[PDB]
């Protein structure tokens, strides 16, 4: 039932420009006017970029005015937002979204799509480097041992540790991620008891997005 | 820009209980204010419009009031399939803008880490880093305190932190202290120590 | 204008037999008489003309005799999709005037029937509000008297009604009382009582 | 074959206007002199407009002459309805109808169309609560159990519930909708055998065209 799909994202190094576009399915396009919506980290929510139900005021926000462009495309269904002079201080999450059509010049945002998201900097991508978490055999608490693999410097985002399905016990915890020097680095445990392990192997699987297995235990 | 303030971002609620959430503008929105729900993935989800307005299905134990600057939204039945975070914004004035969200996360009875400490693999130190890792994990409540120490003093510098976020099956959350050494000063050096504080104790655990 | 007019609306017969149906007009219309056949969803159609002109495809069962102030469908071997609502018309004079129509039921066998009686729900008291709903389904009579209690006693007005229209494939009917409730006056009883009288049972449906 | 649709319909905010245009098919459009005939409702029908095959003669109500002109667009073609001066009591379906070109001068509709039905009336639109009725469990007199939904509060109507196309029972009772306090309300009940519910979930699916579509149950 009414959908947005986003469609820009990258990682882009501070200067350039982009455009992310969007893709409207769900209801008649024409009688509703968009906006953008940034969901920048550690700091806000930021609404970036309005244009008005088919074209009369494509309406920006003091801060990327002058770089933004919010341009739209009815008969063809899809919102666009080309970019210019991207800063680092725009990398972020984008949110195609819809207008409401409810009530007394209210601005809201009646739909909301995936998100697109679009890292701006310089630094470059760089592989993950998986390690594994161990202890010896046994040793935890019991009779069941916890372990991990340490996954060290990556650049961007997502690395995914994945671990083993099969649960008679088998927690993985993941530690959420942190930056560190311009890298992401972060951990996941889990936990058999005690008969397994050292008894047969155990492994973690590290894959980055740009393109990189690791495998280990 | 009106500065839109949503003071208290953490609330424990329990379950079959109301939140109250609250909201207040810098200036006076004409009751126009909005409440938006974002949930662990992307998911922002309209909730209610014009101070008021519930948008369709959005199930009725949702409701808001807020006249003047000052808003808040109050679940009836906080059900366990309400807890993201929450965001409170402003249709009147532009840069239309945003409360800043207030988690929300379940309570539960206590509990402690069963901590854990890691050394160097071997690959590593070849590499030429020392990161010794030690993770206390299933506990409630979030915070956990941790200390490290080198041959008798603590170490602070070095050290970096990350939770898991809340665990689905029982609420309880993991974390890791990891001082990041290289392989020579881990070898001046001899016990390594991880030692933690939390609510349910009054030994450090270690 | 004429005025006419169908005394007779809903009339029950059986499957197979005669079903004369009767229309009459205030002046000496003048055989100039039409019979129109409403179908259970939308769908008109001619069935007679000029009072006695059987369009095209129309079925033998359809005859209709009438003249000066008085005329009729008549149906012979009463089939099942012949089951519908008909009106007729003078398309004689301005403006064309037709008679209201005659709903025409499945005279079927008697059934008691099964009343199921929901609480409020959680999300109406939420709302506020409170409906309870009373379901007797599946019944033939039609007729069937219902009646709430709220801690004994009769409740008056609070009760909507409503009934389906012959099910489609057992010729059964069924009822919706709500009485609705305040939850705030809801709060203050605890008895809710629907209660049925129906021709099928010497005693009543609680 | 003689197929012949309408096309305006609407709530219409009492005043105003619309136009009704009727699209006819399967003979020779110019023979046949057109009529609209309209179901406003506790009444039933009403004739109110006719034009001769070609246009020399127009013949309308008392009802709504002075506000409502026929008109017929021959080619194949058309046929039209533009109404104005819109007295709520005009509220109804609309239909098409072909003449008779039969006998002798009578007056007499040759075939239907299905109608736009046309709502007068302010009332502003709601979607609608979609209230889920439910049992402690188990229930009809024994087993088999009658879940139910309570929509209650629209307009302007319809709402449309489904359930489960699910053969179990699978009878689904819709009542019909009784309009009171303007908004209009319903139910829709259905049995489960209950070797069912809630072993495996129901869900009532409540959909009214202005739009919504709620789920739930």
């Known amino acids: 039932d009414v959908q947005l799909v986003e469609s820009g994202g990258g990682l882009v190094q501070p200067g350039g420009s982009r455009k992310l576009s969007c893709?409207?399915?769900?209801?008649?396009?024409?009688?509703?006017?968009?906006?953008?919506v940034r969901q920048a980290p550690e700091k806000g929510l930021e609404w970036?970029?309005?244009?008005?139900?088919?074209?009369?005021?494509?309406?920006?926000?003091d801060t990327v005015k002058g770089r933004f462009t919010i341009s739209r495309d009815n008969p063809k269904n899809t919102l666009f937002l080309q970019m210019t002079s991207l800063r680092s201080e725009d990398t972020a999450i984008?949110?195609?979204?819809?207008?409401?059509?409810?009530?007394?010049?209210?601005?809201?945002?009646?739909?909301?799509?995936?998100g697109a998201t679009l890292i701006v900097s310089s630094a470059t991508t760089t592989a993950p480097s998986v390690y594994p978490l161990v202890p010896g055999c046994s040793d935890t608490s019991g009779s069941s041992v916890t372990l991990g693999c340490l996954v060290k410097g990556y650049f961007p985002g997502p690395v995914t540790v994945k671990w083993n399905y099969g649960a008679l016990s088998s927690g993985v915890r993941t530690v959420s991620s942190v930056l560190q020097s311009g890298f992401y680095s972060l951990s996941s445990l889990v936990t058999v008891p005690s008969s397994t392990w050292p008894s047969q192997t155990v492994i973690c699987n590290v894959a980055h997005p740009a393109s990189k297995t690791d495998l280990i235990k | 820009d009106i500065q839109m303030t949503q003071i208290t971002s953490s609330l424990s609620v329990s379950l079959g209980d109301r939140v109250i959430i609250s909201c207040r503008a810098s200036q006076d929105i004409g009751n126009f204010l909005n409440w938006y729900q974002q949930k662990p993935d992307g998911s922002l989800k309209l909730l209610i419009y014009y101070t008021s307005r519930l948008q369709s299905g959005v199930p009725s134990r949702f409701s808001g009031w807020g006249s003047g600057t000052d808003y808040s939204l109050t679940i009836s039945n906080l059900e366990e399939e309400d807890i993201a975070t929450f965001f409170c914004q402003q249709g009147k004035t532009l840069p239309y803008t945003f409360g800043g969200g207030t988690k929300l996360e379940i309570k539960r009875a206590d509990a402690a880490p069963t901590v854990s400490i890691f050394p160097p693999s071997s690959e590593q130190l070849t590499s030429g880093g020392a990161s010794v890792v030690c993770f206390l994990n299933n506990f409630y409540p979030k915070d956990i305190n941790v200390k490290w120490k080198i041959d008798g003093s603590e170490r602070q510098n070095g050290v970096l932190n990350s939770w898991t976020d809340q665990d689905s099956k029982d609420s309880t959350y993991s974390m890791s202290s990891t001082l990041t050494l290289t392989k020579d000063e881990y070898e001046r050096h001899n016990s390594y120590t991880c030692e933690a504080t939390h609510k349910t104790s009054t030994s450090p655990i270690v | 204008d004429i005025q006419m007019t169908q005394i007779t609306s809903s009339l029950s017969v059986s499957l197979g037999d005669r079903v004369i149906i009767s229309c009459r007009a205030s002046q000496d219309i003048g055989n100039f008489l039409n019979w129109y056949q409403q179908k259970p969803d939308g769908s008109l159609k001619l069935l007679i003309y000029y009072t006695s002109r059987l369009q095209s495809g129309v079925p033998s069962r359809f005859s209709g005799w009438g003249s000066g102030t008085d005329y009729s469908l008549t149906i012979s071997n009463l089939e099942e999709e012949d089951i519908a609502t008909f009106f007729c018309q003078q398309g004689k004079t301005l403006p064309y005037t037709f008679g209201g129509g005659t709903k025409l039921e499945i005279k079927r066998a008697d059934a008691a029937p099964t009343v199921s009686i929901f609480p409020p729900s959680s999300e109406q008291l939420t709302s506020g509000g409170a409906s309870v709903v009373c379901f007797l389904n599946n019944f033939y009579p039609k007729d069937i008297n219902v009646k709430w209690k709220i801690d004994g006693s009769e409740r008056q007005n609070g009760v909507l009604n409503s009934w389906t229209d012959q099910d489609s494939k057992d010729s059964t009917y069924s009822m919706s009382s709500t009485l609705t409730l305040t939850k705030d006056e809801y709060e203050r009883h605890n008895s809710y009582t629907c209660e049925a009288t129906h021709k099928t049972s010497t005693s009543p449906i609680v | 074959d003689v197929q012949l649709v309408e096309s305006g319909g609407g709530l219409v905010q009492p005043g105003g206007s619309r136009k009704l245009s009727c699209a006819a098919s399967?003979?020779?459009?110019?023979?046949?002199?057109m009529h609209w005939v309209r179901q406003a409702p506790e009444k039933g029908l009403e004739w109110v407009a006719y034009?001769?095959?070609?246009?020399?003669?127009?013949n309308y109500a008392d009802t709504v002459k002075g506000r409502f002109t026929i008109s017929r667009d021959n080619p194949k073609n058309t046929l039209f309805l533009q109404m104005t001066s819109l007295r709520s009591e005009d509220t109804a379906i609309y239909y098409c109808?072909?003449?008779?070109?039969?006998?002798?001068?009578?007056?007499?509709?040759?075939?239907w169309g299905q109608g736009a039905t046309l709502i007068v009336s302010s009332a502003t639109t709601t979607a609608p609560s979609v209230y889920p009725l439910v049992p402690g469990c188990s229930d009809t007199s024994g087993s088999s159990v009658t879940l139910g939904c309570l929509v209650k509060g629209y307009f302007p109507g319809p709402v449309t519930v489904k359930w489960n196309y699910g053969a179990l029972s699978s009878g689904v009772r819709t009542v019909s909708s009784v309009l009171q306090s303007g908004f209009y309300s319903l139910s829709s009940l259905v049995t489960v055998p209950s070797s069912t519910w809630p072993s495996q979930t129901v869900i009532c699916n409540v959909a009214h065209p202005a739009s919504k579509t709620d789920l739930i149950k």
């Open positions: 109808t072909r003449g008779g070109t039969g006998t002798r001068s009578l007056y007499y509709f040759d075939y």
């Open positions: 034009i001769s095959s070609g246009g020399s003669s127009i």
């Open positions: 399967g003979f020779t459009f110019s023979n046949f002199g």
